[PDB]
Amino acid sequence: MKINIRDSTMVRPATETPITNLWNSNVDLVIPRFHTPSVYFYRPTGASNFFDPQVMKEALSKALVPFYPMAGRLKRDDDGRIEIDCNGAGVLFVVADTPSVIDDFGDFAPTLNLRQLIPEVDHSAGIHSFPLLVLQVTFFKCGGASLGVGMQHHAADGFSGLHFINTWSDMARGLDLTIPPFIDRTLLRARDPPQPAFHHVEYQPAPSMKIPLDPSKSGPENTTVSIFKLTRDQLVALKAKSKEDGNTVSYSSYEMLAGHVWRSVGKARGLPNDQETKLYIATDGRSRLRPQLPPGYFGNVIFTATPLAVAGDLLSKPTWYAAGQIHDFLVRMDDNYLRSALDYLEMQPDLSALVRGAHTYKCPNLGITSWVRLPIYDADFGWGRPIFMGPGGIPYEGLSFVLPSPTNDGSLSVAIALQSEHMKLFEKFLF
């Protein structure tokens, strides 16, 4: 899998954008320290026109006017707090070629030679050097191309990120902005003074293994990334179930699915009865914060639900028990709880310390991020919607994504990184 960079360009906003510093809220700070990798794959239309770099770059430049912070840089304020320096410095746009064909990627598992479709950032050099957004269009010998996205998560969550990407693809089709970015994270400013109302389990350290894992089995070595498809039908049966073993309470499709994955993972890993496993579920607070956020709110509004169970219970009890634990946390996360969370974060002396990076997600724990509602397939640059869109490679073991069907259809895909031996067993999944 060899990549030949053809051309590299620092694209700037088409016109003068505001020169300003953009404050980060507590949840723009407690985010991963890296560029979130995502990848789109497109079949060729057969037209010579296909993904014309000039069309792409002119559109990019246009989109970087309403979404100008995306073209800025990181800097710290006088208190060492990370903020966005909106200096319109720009976004990296790379074009590459490869002798490989798209079909080499087979099923499109986020293995991380898929990371080669995204330009790599050399982190430091400084905090202020590397651009917030990197982009690579890669032309395959088969005629198709990929779009690789690397987005510094301080700029935005996947929700605002997609807002920008889709807006970009729109402008490439001569269309204009639809919902303008609303740019002001101070709506998530903590209350003054901070008064937490809950004990927030989502910010407490993850359970470690009672018996220390074999390092020759648990490194990034011997960590495998795979994908699996549920049909629907299996998704129909999965949600029901639920009535299993006399149980009367009806849980939601996500809840039953996430519990099933969670449970399937524990079985695959052979967790002993007394072992605790913590599940990390990324939750969007746009819909829950009850003063109610503007459409096109530009930033991070991701909170975290973390149900916990002893494996003895999780794996021996029916799947609706796992779904129950999940539901029990998800339902507690109303505006009041979220506001409590912001105030809790406000009282911590260093938010960088609360950033999960697995350790957090390593065995015996797990993260399930669902993109099922994200408009991940709307990025049509003029040559059609992507045949696939997924995480640009899963770094940590124990991290997993739920992807919606490109065709649609009511099938889902689960993309997961597990220890290699554990991965073969993870087919408690279709079980």
Ligand X SMILES: CC(C)(COP(=O)(O)OP(=O)(O)OC[C@H]1O[C@@H](n2cnc3c(N)ncnc32)[C@H](O)[C@@H]1OP(=O)(O)O)[C@@H](O)C(=O)NCCC(=O)NCCSC(=O)/C=C/c1ccc(O)cc1
- Known binding residues are 252-255, 284-290, 370-373
Considering the complex, what minimum distance in angstroms separates the CB of residue 283 from ligand X? 4
Rounded to a whole number of angstroms, the minimum distance from the CB of residue 235 to ligand X is 12
How is the chain split among helix, strand and coil, in percent rounded to 5? Answer: 25, 25, 50
Q: To the nearest whole angstrom, how small is the minimum distance from the Cβ of residue 258 to ligand X? A: 8
Q: Decide if residue 283 touches ligand X (CB under 6 A).
A: yes
Q: What is the C-alpha separation between 150 and 154, in angstroms, rounded? A: 12
Encoded amino acid at 109, one letter: A
Query: From the candidates 153, 163, 327, 422, which is the catalytic residue?
Result: 153
360 part of the interface to ligand X, by CB under 6 A: no
Residue 9 identity (one-letter amino acid): T
403 binds ligand X (CB under 6 A): no
Known binding-site residues for 4-coumaroyl-CoA equal: 252-255, 284-290, 370-373
The nearer residue to ligand X, 207 or 375, going by C-beta atoms, is 375
Residue among 21, 23, 25, 22 at smallest CA distance from 302: 25
**Selection from 221, 241, 211 nearest residue 311 by Cα:** 211
Which residues are within 8 A (CB) of 297 and not within 5 positions of it... i.e. 6 or more apart? 160, 182, 187, 286
287 binds ligand X (CB under 6 A): yes
Please state the separation of Cα 321 from the chain's center in Å: 26
* Least Cβ distance, residue 213 to ligand X (angstroms): 26
* Residue 380 known to be catalytic: yes
Q: Spell out a b/e string for 72-82, using b for 16 or more CB atoms within 10 Å of the CB, else e.
A: bbbeeeeeeeb
Binding segment for ligand X (CB under 6 A), chosen from 14-22, 236-244, 252-260, 291-299, is 252-260
DSSP H or E segment with residue 235 = helix 234-239
If one asks whether residue 282 binds ligand X (CB under 6 A), the answer comes out as yes
Cα 359–chain centre separation: 18
Positions 138 through 177 that interact with ligand X (CB under 6 A): 149, 151, 157-158, 161-162, 165
Identify which of residues 340 and 400 has a Cβ nearer to ligand X in the complex: 400
Residue 253 lies near ligand X (rule: CB under 6 A):
yes
Instruction: State the DSSP string of 268-315.
Output: HTT--TT-EEEEEEEEE-TTT-TT-PPTTB-S--EEEE--EEEHHHHH
Is 284 one of the binding residues for ligand X (CB under 6 A)? yes
Tell me, yes or no, if 153 is annotated catalytic.
yes
Letters for 104-143 (x = contact with ligand X by CB under 6 A, - = none) are: ----------------------------------------
User: Closest separation between CB of residue 346 and ligand X, Å?
Assistant: 22
Question: Among 50, 371, 383, 429, which residue sits at the site for ligand X (rule: CB under 6 A)?
Answer: 371
Residues 4-43, interacting with ligand X (CB under 6 A): 36, 38
Given a contact cutoff of 8 angstroms between Cβ atoms, the answer to whether 363 and 416 are in contact is: no
Question: Is residue 369 within the footprint of ligand X (CB under 6 A)?
Answer: yes
**CA atoms of 217 and 213, how far apart (whole Å):** 8
Whether residue 148 contacts residue 392, with contact meaning beta carbons closer than 8 Å, is answered with: yes
By CB under 6 A, residue 254 contacts ligand X: yes
Residues annotated catalytic, as ranges? 153, 380
- Binding residues (CB under 6 A) for ligand X: these are 36, 38, 149, 151, 157-158, 161-162, 165, 252-255, 282-284, 287, 330, 369-371
